[PDB]
DNA sequence: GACAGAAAGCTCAAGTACTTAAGCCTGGTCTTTACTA
């Protein structure tokens, strides 16, 4: 049944329990932004990493 | 003066030196100086 309106769904959906894994990769460890931060010593260019 | 031989020359196959080798990103760990003097 549709969660929003309560109407039945015309197609019949395949459902069941399946074993799922959470992986090490998370967005909080990958999100990054830069604006006039640290400057490399030799090239006077933005840092790496 | 006509031939042949010995010449410098020239070109053409093998061998050698040198080059590049995807893009971005995240971590971790280790180490710069150990050894003779």
From Swiss-Prot:
The modification N6-methyllysine is found at residue 24. It is found in: Nucleus. Disulfide bonds: none annotated. Catalytic core component of RNA polymerase II (Pol II), a DNA-dependent RNA polymerase which synthesizes mRNA precursors and many functional non-coding RNAs using the four ribonucleoside triphosphates as substrates. Pol II-mediated transcription cycle proceeds through transcription initiation, transcription elongation and transcription termination stages. RNA-dependent RNA polymerase that catalyzes the extension of a non-coding RNA (ncRNA) at the 3'-end using the four ribonucleoside triphosphates as substrates. An internal ncRNA sequence near the 3'-end serves as a template in a single-round Pol II-mediated RNA polymerization reaction. May decrease the stability of ncRNAs that repress Pol II-mediated gene transcription. Component of the RNA polymerase II (Pol II) core complex consisting of 12 subunits: a ten-subunit catalytic core composed of POLR2A/RPB1, POLR2B/RPB2, POLR2C/RPB3, POLR2I/RPB9, POLR2J/RPB11, POLR2E/RPABC1, POLR2F/RPABC2, POLR2H/RPABC3, POLR2K/RPABC4 and POLR2L/RPABC5 and a mobile stalk composed of two subunits POLR2D/RPB4 and POLR2G/RPB7, protruding from the core and functioning primarily in transcription initiation. Part of Pol II(G) complex, in which Pol II core associates with an additional subunit POLR2M; unlike conventional Pol II, Pol II(G) functions as a transcriptional repressor. Belongs to the RNA polymerase beta chain family. This is DNA-directed RNA polymerase II subunit RPB2. It comes from Homo sapiens. The chain holds residues 1029 to 1077 of 1174 of the full protein.
């Amino acid at each position: 049944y549709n969660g929003f309106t309560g109407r039945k769904i015309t197609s019949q959906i395949f459902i069941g329990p399946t074993y799922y894994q959470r992986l090490k990769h998370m967005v909080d460890d990958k999100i990054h932004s830069r604006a006039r931060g640290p400057i490399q010593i030799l090239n006077r260019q933005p840092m790496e990493g």
